[PDB]
Ligand binder design. Structure first.
Ligand code: HB3
Ligand code: HB3
Ligand code: HB3
Ligand code: HB3
Ligand code: HB3
Ligand code: HB3
Ligand code: CL
Ligand code: CL
Ligand code: CL
Ligand code: CL
Ligand code: CL
Ligand code: CL
Ligand code: CL
Ligand code: CL
Ligand code: MN
Ligand code: MN
Ligand code: MN
Ligand code: MN
Ligand code: MN
Ligand code: MN
Ligand code: MN
Ligand code: MN
Ligand code: MN
Ligand code: MN
Ligand code: MN
Ligand code: MN
Lengths: 190, 190, 190, 190, 190, 190
């Protein structure tokens, strides 16, 4: 009913997305960027989407092309699956407490791309989240939200009210976007 | 069930309001102030009210007396139609993204008039929205929210978190108020 | 189903709490601190809890030990009654207008204690609310929210956006927490 | 070869665009907003496009819906007519002196919507250009550039280095965008 | 006609460059520093050079010696291939929009080495671009432009007007230099 | 075709100008002010004009009357030789790197005299360039650009982005103006 399959093959990367808006949080994400997988898994889950994301890309350069291409493909999928947008809440918002962090997100499935990203502390624009694999530069948080909004053709406002930990700040943001989308895509009983 | 018809005849103007709180967004507004009609139409619509507004007034002087008298009559109608306020959510709030603008509104159908209007950029206190008809001075936004709160006997808090375009800032505010009212007037299942 | 009875006997005080999360606002509070009773009654009521609170303590010293011990016992009760936390909204938030005051609260029933208390004007850290009985020092607002979060094992973020009256600022906060809890403990249909 | 016809009918307005990128400046614009017609005529002309723009809309409210809808339809047309974007310069830029004003524009026909609008003096965010017809609020300059970039799927950077007259500042900007587009859409001999 | 082959063997590294100024963007770069390869590939491509770069070096220490030695060898090649500099445009410049970033570059193939690097945000002087291989410290951007200018014996001015993402800021700069070189090396018809 | 001969005899000086816009840089300048000759030679050359300038004047007072009268006569010549201005690019601009200096110039052969001169460091308004002959006060740079624009009836914007050496700052400016004129006077193929 509200499903979309997107394939996006560039010189930089290969993306397959399968998205059902009316899911139960059945989510599997594999981008080669494990922190990004964790964020996109928290997004799909907290949005009660069924989401499959399979991505390979030029992670020898860094995560950027794969992160952006995935966010672009995911946006296209959200847009396609929404279709005519008949009888939906359309507007949604969500606060996400995560220990010391508070994030907020607000959406208008308007058909008019716009992203406003505010309140993220300045140290996130050169912070790295690094494990045993390909690292995640938090400077990309904004890039992900803008790419998502641009390609889904929605108004997305993402706010950090406050926070310290870059992992908490990033996850709370992805989760805020997720629960804001969840409210907005729900059928409107009126 | 939750309907009210208000007639308000002053030396300055003539207002007829018909309001059903349990509507499907069937809205018709004619004040002689076309931007005001657009705002009151977005309010009635986004609140899922059925709303009729018919107003004539001294627009040769300017929109002010007609805008205020309409907002006063509309408040009286909201108050009357709410009646005893038994079993309603009572509290409501809504974020409205509109491109670069973010507006918020929060209501307590408390029975105690109060309006707090914050965050509206200072250029709105001398900005004009002008077409081929009677213009709308955005300095009146506040006046409209105060008149509404005063005559509905509710607590209304309207916030501009940020924004640039005076049309976006004004509409987002009217829409925020609308969706906050919509949540608050809904039957409370508990 | 989601009920808990907590008894907490210290050298300082004696607390009995009976809490049903799936209540209809049937609330009775008696701490010997009448303003505190009013706040805990507004919390239980606005959360649609059924809540009984019976507390006696060393109010000859002042309200502090009784207020804290009650908040601790209440948290333990909220935590116990929540149990496994299966199928709940988990996240909740609420704006509370109260005349000139606007308060906000956001919860994650995460299982990870955290409290962030922001925006409360500085005069509240030495303000007294005094009647014909034991007075309430508003400096304790924070202490109550921290004790609640610590013992329920939840993330609680409480914000005063603005306000002047210490009674309005305090009640709006307790009410915000209540409606945020109410949303978060509701069954999640997905 | 590089032509597109766009029809955009909303509740607010009706737009017909016919655009040839390989034109000789044969341009006719009729929006009901005469200053906007002058700007879109200078854009089509200075870009050496052949451009027809026919628009009717709710100018009784003000120019905004008609201006935005036209800019949206024009962007869609630019995007469609560009097609595969094979063998074009792709990047373009232009300085426009206009008496005391200096404007600049830079484009990447990247396929990735982005607009950056900088240097416009603050008085333009509440300035009106008014004649015998429907007026033009210069606050809309930005809205036009963003809508254009969003719907053509291009990177558009528009800069006011300096200027005083709102007519000079606005026209120089439209002309800068035009000559930047003209360079970028030219066949690349390599 | 305008070709050069440079071999540069130091204790630190081994470089082979083959450069044709009159190319069609046939570019292959392998330095062991994959982000650097991406930047030098965007430079060769956007300059319509045919460029081969093969480099091995002490990347166990870090990318610096290999990045610098390559930039030095590339400069020597640009200088040699330019020869007498008869009948060329000599001056070139280019703006590069890249999402939020705007970069500019201006060249005088003067025969007089000079580099001015301005506007790069301060976080780039300790930012890392890290993938699955050898990382790239953006502090080296300047070093690359200076080495290039020093060894090609040209005036190179590289400017960041604004930008946030370190990947966008760096690539836009390399691309600006490329398109500025492309204009300047073109035959001058006069 | 695009040639002009101007004679200007005042009490202060005698000027003969012969100007061909479609030249090959065949330039001869003799004003009695050798630095001025060098600047006007770089202007004629870099503009691909054929230019003859012969001037005698009251250099016992200082260079000013001769410099201004020459700039006036040169402007008259540029204006006359341009004639109807049919089928020309009309707009032109050029960046000039000169070691540490960056200058820019932008022209609109609009028929409407205007000069904006910005960014020149303050020490140039009392700096002297002195050899074995009549010296050149750099305070006259502005006077030359204004006289040129006034008498050619063009919009001339001259900018120093930065620089230190007064010889580099002055020459880069004259060269910027020259290459901006060269682009603008070229036949427009469309
Ligand atoms: N995928 C290539 C165009 S977008 C980009 N962002 C960073 N580098 N390239
Ligand atoms: N272990 C999951 C809940 S706590 C957390 N901190 C960072 N991410 N998640
Ligand atoms: N009388 C109850 C509503 S108004 C109020 N002010 C302080 N507490 N309540
Ligand atoms: N065309 C309606 C959606 S966009 C808008 N801008 C101003 N009002 N509405
Ligand atoms: N008359 C056209 C050239 S001058 C101008 N000022 C404002 N617009 N155009
Ligand atoms: N020798 C000519 C190129 S370098 C220079 N410095 C000052 N004028 N020219
Ligand atoms: Cl989680
Ligand atoms: Cl709408
Ligand atoms: Cl109450
Ligand atoms: Cl908020
Ligand atoms: Cl014109
Ligand atoms: Cl590219
Ligand atoms: Cl030279
Ligand atoms: Cl510039
Ligand atoms: Mn990118
Ligand atoms: Mn995590
Ligand atoms: Mn009034
Ligand atoms: Mn509107
Ligand atoms: Mn204590
Ligand atoms: Mn009270
Ligand atoms: Mn708009
Ligand atoms: Mn004009
Ligand atoms: Mn070095
Ligand atoms: Mn890249
Ligand atoms: Mn003079
Ligand atoms: Mn010189």
């Amino acid at each position: 009913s509200r499903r979309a399959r997107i394939e996006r093959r560039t010189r930089e990367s290969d993306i397959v997305i399968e998205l059902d808006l009316d899911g139960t949080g059945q989510v599997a994400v594999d981008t080669g960027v494990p922190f990004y997988d964790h964020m996109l898994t928290a997004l799909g889950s907290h949005a009660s989407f069924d989401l499959t994301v399979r991505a390979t890309g030029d992670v020898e350069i860094e995560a950027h092309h794969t992160i952006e291409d995935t966010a672009i493909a995911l946006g296209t999928a959200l847009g396609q699956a929404l279709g005519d947008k008949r009888g939906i809440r359309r507007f949604g918002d969500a606060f996400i407490p995560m220990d010391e962090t508070l994030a907020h997100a607000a959406v208008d499935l308007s058909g008019r791309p716009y992203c406003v990203h505010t309140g993220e502390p300045d140290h996130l624009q050169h912070t790295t989240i690094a494990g045993s694999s390909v690292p995640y530069h938090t400077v990309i948080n904004r890039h992900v939200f803008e790419s998502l909004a641009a390609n889904a053709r929605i108004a997305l406002h993402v706010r950090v009210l406050y926070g310290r930990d870059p992992h908490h700040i990033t996850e709370a943001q992805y989760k805020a976007v997720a629960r804001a989308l969840r409210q907005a895509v729900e059928p409107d009983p009126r």
